[PDB]
Design an enzyme around this catalytic site. Sequence first.
Site, PDB file in Angstrom:
ATOM      1  N   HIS A  79      -0.781  18.728   1.750  1.00  0.00           N
ATOM      2  CA  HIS A  79      -1.141  17.371   2.137  1.00  0.00           C
ATOM      3  C   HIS A  79      -1.382  17.319   3.639  1.00  0.00           C
ATOM      4  O   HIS A  79      -0.610  17.888   4.415  1.00  0.00           O
ATOM      5  CB  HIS A  79       0.014  16.409   1.746  1.00  0.00           C
ATOM      6  CG  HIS A  79      -0.353  14.955   1.715  1.00  0.00           C
ATOM      7  ND1 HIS A  79      -0.619  14.213   2.852  1.00  0.00           N
ATOM      8  CD2 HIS A  79      -0.440  14.092   0.672  1.00  0.00           C
ATOM      9  CE1 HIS A  79      -0.886  12.963   2.504  1.00  0.00           C
ATOM     10  NE2 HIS A  79      -0.794  12.867   1.186  1.00  0.00           N
ATOM     11  N   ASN A 131      -6.856  11.110   1.202  1.00  0.00           N
ATOM     12  CA  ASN A 131      -5.654  10.287   1.109  1.00  0.00           C
ATOM     13  C   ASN A 131      -5.750   9.000   1.914  1.00  0.00           C
ATOM     14  O   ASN A 131      -5.052   8.041   1.575  1.00  0.00           O
ATOM     15  CB  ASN A 131      -4.411  11.086   1.518  1.00  0.00           C
ATOM     16  CG  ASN A 131      -4.578  11.829   2.822  1.00  0.00           C
ATOM     17  OD1 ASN A 131      -5.134  12.923   2.851  1.00  0.00           O
ATOM     18  ND2 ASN A 131      -4.052  11.263   3.895  1.00  0.00           N
ATOM     19  N   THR A 162       0.487  12.782   8.203  1.00  0.00           N
ATOM     20  CA  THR A 162       0.305  11.343   8.350  1.00  0.00           C
ATOM     21  C   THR A 162       1.121  10.851   9.534  1.00  0.00           C
ATOM     22  O   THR A 162       1.902  11.596  10.133  1.00  0.00           O
ATOM     23  CB  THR A 162       0.729  10.584   7.092  1.00  0.00           C
ATOM     24  OG1 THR A 162       2.138  10.767   6.887  1.00  0.00           O
ATOM     25  CG2 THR A 162      -0.071  11.085   5.876  1.00  0.00           C
ATOM     26  N   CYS A 210      -1.002   7.829  -2.292  1.00  0.00           N
ATOM     27  CA  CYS A 210      -2.221   8.623  -2.406  1.00  0.00           C
ATOM     28  C   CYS A 210      -2.068   9.722  -3.456  1.00  0.00           C
ATOM     29  O   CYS A 210      -2.915   9.868  -4.345  1.00  0.00           O
ATOM     30  CB  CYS A 210      -2.585   9.212  -1.037  1.00  0.00           C
ATOM     31  SG  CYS A 210      -1.180  10.013  -0.160  1.00  0.00           S
ATOM     32  N   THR A 212       0.827  -1.217   0.000  1.00  0.00           N
ATOM     33  CA  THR A 212       0.000   0.000   0.000  1.00  0.00           C
ATOM     34  C   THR A 212       0.858   1.264   0.000  1.00  0.00           C
ATOM     35  O   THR A 212       0.662   2.191   0.788  1.00  0.00           O
ATOM     36  CB  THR A 212      -0.968   0.004   1.186  1.00  0.00           C
ATOM     37  OG1 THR A 212      -0.252   0.216   2.413  1.00  0.00           O
ATOM     38  CG2 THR A 212      -1.746  -1.304   1.265  1.00  0.00           C
TER      39      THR A 212
END
Lengths: 338, 338, 338, 338
Positions: free
Chosen positions: D182, D318, D185, D155, D124
Amino acid sequence: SMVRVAINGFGRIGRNFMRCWLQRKANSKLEIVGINDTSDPRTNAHLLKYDSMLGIFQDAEITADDDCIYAGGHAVKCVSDRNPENLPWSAWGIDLVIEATGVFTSREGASKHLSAGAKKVLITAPGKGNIPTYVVGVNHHTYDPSEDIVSNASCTTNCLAPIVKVLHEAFGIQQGMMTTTHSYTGDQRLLDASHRDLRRARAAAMNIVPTSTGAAKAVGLVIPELQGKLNGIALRVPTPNVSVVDFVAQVEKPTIAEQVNQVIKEASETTMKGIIHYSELELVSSDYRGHNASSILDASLTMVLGGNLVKVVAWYDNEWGYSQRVLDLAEHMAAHWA
Amino acid sequence: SMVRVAINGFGRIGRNFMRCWLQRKANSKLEIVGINDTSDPRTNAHLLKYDSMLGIFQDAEITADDDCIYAGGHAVKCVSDRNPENLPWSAWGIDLVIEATGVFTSREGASKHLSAGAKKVLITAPGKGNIPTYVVGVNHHTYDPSEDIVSNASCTTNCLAPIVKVLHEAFGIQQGMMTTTHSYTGDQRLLDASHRDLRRARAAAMNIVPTSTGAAKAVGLVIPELQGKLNGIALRVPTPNVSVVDFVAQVEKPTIAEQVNQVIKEASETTMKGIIHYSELELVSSDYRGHNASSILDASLTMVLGGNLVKVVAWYDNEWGYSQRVLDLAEHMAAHWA
Amino acid sequence: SMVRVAINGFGRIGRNFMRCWLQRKANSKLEIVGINDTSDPRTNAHLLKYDSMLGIFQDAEITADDDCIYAGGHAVKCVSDRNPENLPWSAWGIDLVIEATGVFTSREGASKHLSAGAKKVLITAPGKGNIPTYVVGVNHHTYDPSEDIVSNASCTTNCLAPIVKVLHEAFGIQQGMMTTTHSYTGDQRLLDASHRDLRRARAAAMNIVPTSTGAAKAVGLVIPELQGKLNGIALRVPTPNVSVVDFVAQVEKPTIAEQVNQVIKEASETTMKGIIHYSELELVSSDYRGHNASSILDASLTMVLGGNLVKVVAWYDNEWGYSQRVLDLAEHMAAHWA
Amino acid sequence: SMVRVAINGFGRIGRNFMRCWLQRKANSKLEIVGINDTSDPRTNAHLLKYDSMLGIFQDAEITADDDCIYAGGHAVKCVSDRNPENLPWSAWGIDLVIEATGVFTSREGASKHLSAGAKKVLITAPGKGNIPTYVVGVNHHTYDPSEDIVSNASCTTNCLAPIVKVLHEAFGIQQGMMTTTHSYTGDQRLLDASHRDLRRARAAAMNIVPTSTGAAKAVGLVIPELQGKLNGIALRVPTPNVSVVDFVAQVEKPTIAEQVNQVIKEASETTMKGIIHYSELELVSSDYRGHNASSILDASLTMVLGGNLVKVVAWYDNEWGYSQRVLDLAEHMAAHWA
Ligand SMILES: NC(=O)c1ccc[n+]([C@@H]2O[C@H](COP(=O)([O-])OP(=O)(O)OC[C@H]3O[C@@H](n4cnc5c(N)ncnc54)[C@H](OP(=O)(O)O)[C@@H]3O)[C@@H](O)[C@H]2O)c1
Ligand SMILES: NC(=O)c1ccc[n+]([C@@H]2O[C@H](COP(=O)([O-])OP(=O)(O)OC[C@H]3O[C@@H](n4cnc5c(N)ncnc54)[C@H](OP(=O)(O)O)[C@@H]3O)[C@@H](O)[C@H]2O)c1
Ligand SMILES: NC(=O)c1ccc[n+]([C@@H]2O[C@H](COP(=O)([O-])OP(=O)(O)OC[C@H]3O[C@@H](n4cnc5c(N)ncnc54)[C@H](OP(=O)(O)O)[C@@H]3O)[C@@H](O)[C@H]2O)c1
Ligand SMILES: NC(=O)c1ccc[n+]([C@@H]2O[C@H](COP(=O)([O-])OP(=O)(O)OC[C@H]3O[C@@H](n4cnc5c(N)ncnc54)[C@H](OP(=O)(O)O)[C@@H]3O)[C@@H](O)[C@H]2O)c1
Ligand SMILES: [Mg+2]
Ligand SMILES: [Mg+2]
């Protein structure tokens, strides 16, 4: 003649402590000579200089090479081993370890530094077990130079205990409840992620997060009279530094808000000078960034009901103010080094 | 036969209230027929549909023209005049105004809606003066249909008063202190800017901000026995919605945490069903977005010391849960419309 | 000798400007003698001293009474009238108004200060209509001393135009696109609320918010050769100060990233000294709080594709850096006064 | 018949993927049978149900015991071993591993799952080294059924590559620059802390943080014609989810903004249906939470200068949008299994 200090864990507290010492270095009995951390000197020198909370360090130059961080000419040797038993503490002649990793707070864990050759360990957190616990201004004069492992308690303990001591001696605290509305710390998760504490698992800058506070138990360790008579919680909220504790006490002697404030003001000018600051200003958390006091009483918020139910509210810079007290405790240990 | 409703002030509460009614419209005695606001129907239809907290409204189509907002065919006439005395309330046959601007909370101010032809006004905030104040589930059955201006109190009052009522009847509340750690609201400033409240002046998403809570006085209005026996404050923090109140009570009958929780659990299943929810889950503020209860007791946080000092902690969605109660109060007024 | 200054609008820029002047007051040809604002001197003195972004002002005492704000024994007279036509500029002998309200950016609006008795107005924003616009370091030497109303453009214009000037002179800018990832400002809403701009209406601290940037048009005003050749947008994000512009240019002379950086570095050491700073450090927005340059080129981010497509990235403190340039422009006017 | 799936790494993407599958489970060729993660099933069930971004999962009951997580009566076996070589993939008959840990992105790392008994691995994230990389809607039909390890890219790659494909086929992309503004994360730090990336080290919720974007290289992997012709960066900002990419292209065929939008709109209705969504609405990041498209073109922001310089702006969730594509790719593999 100087006490040689190593920092274990160069994190928020480790680096705040370092910057505290750099600013007070001229009047110190301590010399920071070593750092152990999970990262390397170049990364750690960068983080020491560029701090999102403290700003850019300006007082001296900070540089690094493969082996050392240099803070204005002063060379700090660096190592990186997660196991304290392997650390070069005898080889570096380390006297005192500042244990700031968060993961060696038990006597067994902190003692690994003693095995590695250090003479004493100061844990920057509540200890697990029978570790002597100190709050400067509350009980640090009871420190015994024979103790090889000590705890400086938590940030909330350092804010609340001086206030409790003053209130207990003036009015007699029978029971007390605490809630700290507290900035998030690195123990919390940036986004939802596994954690032993299912609420600290949750995105810290998004959420009000109830959790534990070390002060619930630690205040009773530094004021033995009140052991078992206090309890409370933390609410972690989306600010990155500076916290405020709300304390509601059942007291023996009836009083009113004005008298509570006057009692704390007088202490802040005498027995607690430099530990408690008394403020009548209408400020907010950003304004207390960098404050050196353990506690800033917000006098406008004091309340009393029925004479015996007292509410006080006190600010604290949980990174910088606490690290100032770590430094004060270490200086005290050095002053009384047998 | 329907009670014709106008919303004055199409803000967070006005629009949350609108969305509450849209979801409950099939079982309502109310028909929202008009909006007065500082903005225009197209802007307000956009904000009604696209909500940063509630998400995109999906149940029905929302459109607008120069004159109306249309919510699934239902036409809501719109006007824009800051002076309520000028509003078309007789011309639109308005029965009940939902007063959600924040600026007409006195009897003189709210009465301008009556002058304009409305029959009754429901203020979505504590009233200033001798305005009857209601909390659904605590005293709303004492509402008198002869009253032309009423208050639904504040979000914190609606969370705390049901809990206080239950605790007072079980243990006898002698005194009580409250602190709500509360999401910021639009009354606060995004960046430092002038405000009548020097702390609400300060950048709201950056700061922990001590300020007033309407619950300090309003709980004693809906539980007259406890008038003058409660006090407390708010700490506004950088979350955009959902709040939590910390209540520390001196009680007459000694108890322990388990019994306090059981008492509230039983009430939440009977007399307070739909008003208090009882939770043993380890959740955080985001999890209570959209909760319909006025209060969610966080049972894991209940504490008692010495039998008589009780701490309880309760969540509330200060936008949505409060607006559900505004709707419940309006439905109650409509049910008893003389 | 001194040019007597009044600040109209004591907001983020008004107060940043005041603090810039207080720190540069020894070499200044300006004397700040008056403030007009919607609020009162006591509120505004509090905000001047206690700033969530700049910290507590400690260079000099700040206090206030009903009529004045006092900064280091300097009395600043205060008035509060939203209509500039009513202001006491004649009586106070005001030479220059710093127009920092955001609502008098047209000639008709700003000219109300001249009617009230001021001699010139410096608008702290792009002008509306035919207002001479200046960016210090780009075209401020073209200042015409007969002008009575001027504009200092916007924060993004002051960041981007110096870099555009250097790139255009070295390589020939044929076209260019800009996006500023920009801290929120007070024009945005803390929670969803009506706004002429349906995206600026949306909760500013929880959203990425596309909107206009004044630099899209203003860079072409201070570099006339490039009128119509640039365009772009802003993305407002949840930081309270410091912004970064991303500029992608189509250039006539083919180049590579190393040469682009060398050209800007050389300018920053010579013709753009003090306006552009050149940085090869890996920093983040917090590190540029308080930076005095209009533009900080983040050299590590420079990229070029195919010779003619150039990407540069530059930081700016949109409150403080911009206010330093407001002060620079006002000083330039005072040195070229007629 | 079912392809038996194990999730390795039950983090933001692992759990978003699980929730995607739970909601698309009726038409699926996949059966999620196992989870490996650093934490335990009870912690991970709690996090699966209580999500700060997605809200509470209410479609089916979620519970857990020592060995399994239960989702709507579906028992998912759980293990906890950081070394994939040790995992019970043979015994559990695992066909496909969803590799969502972030630390097994090379063939040597991901192949440990094959050693443990799995037949294929879907990473991923961009692969490290020669890992076949796919973007659904761009090149997933080129899937080679003999491949045992594949990548779903990042993403940003999934947002940008569909738009790049449409623009390249219509106008001919010669070069292009990208900047993604963005959400932060979990790879970033909540407070300043050591990191291989000195900017991702910095407090994520209080900084704009320049860093790398996987799309700078990955778009050229799924559109081979464009290898070496694109570059760009990320600016991580203090939102917890939803991101926006800004793409400035140099194109061969001159065009204007209206034609660019028409071309992308037509693709979104035909060959890119369900991958690109076309929007003319004035929305902000919160409004795209949960959007299923890989890319949402914000048509109001399209700009063109000089015919050949094209700027487009596209939103993406995302976490959720990307996880929907992970599920789409896994379903494609299951439908082309060998
Ligand atoms: N922050 C506060 O307000 C505060 C106040 C009072 C007391 N404390 C206490 O101080 C301690 C540190 O907290 P903090 O906020 O500074 O956290 P932190 O920022 O995570 O600092 C801990 C540091 O120790 C490093 N580390 C972790 N395990 C290690 C090991 N085995 N050996 C060597 N270094 C190791 C960490 O590296 P990594 O980043 O790679 O993990 C990090 O650099 C904890 O006990 C905390 O409860 C914190
Ligand atoms: N938010 C909460 O959690 C909460 C909970 C309980 C009760 N309340 C109370 O509800 C009231 C509204 O609060 P809120 O959060 O909804 O604030 P808000 O978002 O500012 O809503 C107030 C609305 O009224 C409009 N308005 C202002 N003055 C007006 C006037 N003279 N005539 C007509 N419309 C006018 C405002 O327009 P502008 O945006 O142009 O000013 C805005 O649309 C206040 O009394 C507040 O204390 C709030
Ligand atoms: N912030 C930035 O980064 C930045 C940078 C460059 C330029 N600018 C420009 O500078 C101007 C001010 O921006 P800001 O961010 O400082 O805004 P701000 O914080 O809202 O400050 C504006 C000030 O003017 C006051 N005011 C408004 N109308 C007035 C009137 N008629 N008479 C007197 N005072 C009045 C406001 O009072 P209230 O609070 O009561 O409304 C506030 O004190 C705008 O043109 C803005 O675009 C801003
Ligand atoms: N988040 C996004 O927007 C996004 C989008 C597309 C792709 N991705 C990619 O997806 C991957 C995961 O990202 P994420 O945001 O979901 O990260 P995350 O929240 O940190 O999730 C990773 C999970 O893997 C666990 N883990 C780590 N090492 C492990 C090991 N050896 N064995 C088993 N479990 C292990 C982690 O446990 P701990 O929490 O204990 O470390 C955590 O549960 C990365 O490759 C990332 O770049 C992320
Ligand atoms: Mg040894
Ligand atoms: Mg009338």
